[PDB]
Amino acid sequence: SNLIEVFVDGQSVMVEPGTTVLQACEKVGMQIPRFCYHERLSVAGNCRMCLVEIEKAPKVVAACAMPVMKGWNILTNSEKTKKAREGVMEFLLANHPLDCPICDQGGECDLQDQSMMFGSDRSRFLEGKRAVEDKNIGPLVKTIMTRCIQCTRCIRFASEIAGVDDLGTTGRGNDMQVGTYIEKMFMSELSGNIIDICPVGALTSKPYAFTARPWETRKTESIDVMDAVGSNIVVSTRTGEVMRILPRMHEDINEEWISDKTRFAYDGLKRQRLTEPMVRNEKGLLTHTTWEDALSRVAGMLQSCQGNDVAAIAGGLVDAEALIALKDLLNRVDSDTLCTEEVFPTAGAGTDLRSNYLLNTTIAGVEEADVVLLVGTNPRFEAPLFNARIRKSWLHNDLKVALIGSPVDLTYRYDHLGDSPKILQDIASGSHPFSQVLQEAKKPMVVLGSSALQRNDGAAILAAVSNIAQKIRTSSGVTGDWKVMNILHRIASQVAALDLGYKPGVEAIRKNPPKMLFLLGADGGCVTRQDLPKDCFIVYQGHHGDVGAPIADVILPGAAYTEKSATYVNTEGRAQQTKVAVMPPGLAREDWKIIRALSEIAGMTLPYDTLDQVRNRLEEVSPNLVRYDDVEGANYFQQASELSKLVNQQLLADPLVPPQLTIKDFYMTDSISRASQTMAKCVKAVTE
């Protein structure tokens, strides 16, 4: 029943049909050394390293692309296998320049490790050693093309994940220049992920370039921000401080890739940080002081201002722990007007009812999908990792991908349907050769973009797309259980705040201008001092305030996403705990620690001191927020759909368009990425 017998030097093992010699050899533990094969891409054979003497054959053959007949025996430790490895490793180091000091992959080479453990020692090839002059690929990626071993890995990565098709082989013989022919500065998404693909020191990071060499820096587990998916991030930290980051692998979500913004956000993280507790002064000015007088001022104002006149706009990148501490304090005083930053409707049970406010499908599970439509968004410029997943699906198996709302640069030949909610009404009616594909398909999926949800058509379009989900789920026999419906987001703390049951959108403070408010990561002009009485008392907490910090009354130096062992939530409910890497500069304390110290200084108390006690209260707010790296789906789609008929709202005819439309509006529109200068360098490289 679909097994193949091979002997790995006598040790028998079973092989699935169609696979390679190399996957079975890696199944028994033997890592055959490789240079061109990599599991996120297709199989080239151009590096020739994986030769292995397979018995009863005078010719020694490759192992990355060999079909596996029944009954092999694979001699890895023979004579001429070692002789072929010696020969190939001697061939690679001929036209490779003496740059191992000035390389940037000293600790992380591949020629160095494999030429120690497999190669010869006395070199040959006395004269010669041609050199290829470098190019200018992009100001984010430093490029030396003499060290290129022409292995054709970045080319396959481009043409099979990026879809950009700008890198190519030019020439013959020895002379194969790999790159772009036309002096074009190659700028696209995931171009930061090519420095991890290139196995030799030929494509390195430009802003990192010459600060450390990776044996000094220690590697630490953490969770991503700025995308609702969370590729698992390993920080290489140095000198009580940083050096760089890399992506490590979760199997399901965000496999071996990472965002360009994520990769190049740490510069703005270390650029303009809020450091001290800052209080206004009798001239009208802003200075800094000790924690005593500042927290006493905030505590006295909190005692002498009560009612519903106390607000908290919690946007940006904050914790679940900080939100639970804030909710404990604010319910402990009298009442609340917590709000988030972005707007999400609550008519058809959007706050509660676990289905209708997260991505209910599995991010790995969209590869098993059949037909997906896509109501207005731009996933190349809104969390590009999910777009890489969609292109992985569309490349390997078969999809039918539709886009409704804006002609944008999705590089994988989408079918566009138009820009009108009345077209969604037609699909609901619905006369198409494609709505037939929806209601007669096997596994249907509708992806909601949240950029079309921050308009004034949230409840009606949400109810209409939920009625589409009800329609196709009750039809087509699908499956059970499995779902058409999922939505996306952009900001992780918004999803965590919806999970903690908050009030999304600042409309409660548009209704109620307060006496007091806490701006926890207020990015821009969510509210003003004009829309509120002139004795505002904002307490703006965070790091590198650019807007809001000139709107300052009481500034608290809130921590960052690398500076605390907090818990974040992705878009599909999987709670993932962050870890401490670098302590915050300045004083710059911890967020929930600031909240409990504020409750201590005020004439009250809160029943927690430790992060274990904070985890206990987070458990008693939600039980799935302690089961870290654990996922479990949602249900009650028909209940959410029949509750989506309470306020039957009209639908506009105006063309819906996302704000995230191009390169610069992907780069700039976050706080920490807005801080940095290397993002400004690549933005002016786009415009110039």
Partner: protein, 126 residues
Amino acid sequence: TQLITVDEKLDITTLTGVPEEHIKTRKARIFVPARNNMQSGVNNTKKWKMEFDTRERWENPLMGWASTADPLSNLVLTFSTKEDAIAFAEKNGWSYDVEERKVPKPKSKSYGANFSWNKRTRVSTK
């Protein structure tokens, strides 16, 4: 010689001498260390490292260094199975966070499928 023995738990934390501040305050984490993504080799897998969480590292005000009041900051304990890891962590007293092991998912790729006729899996370059 066939003496008292009773089937119970272990309490070595009253013997190993590290103070109770570091016992109850600091938290352990058990994980297989991920593959350092720039290389692609998983000999750095197959081990279960036990680490402690990071803490404050200020500036040394004369040379520009990262001093710390953390003796336990540079511990690592490479193990072979999750069971003995959890058993040792519960034996020596402090708390621990278990992250689960994630293998690379087996795939289905072929060069002939990269040379398709009417399937969209096409190399488009070579």
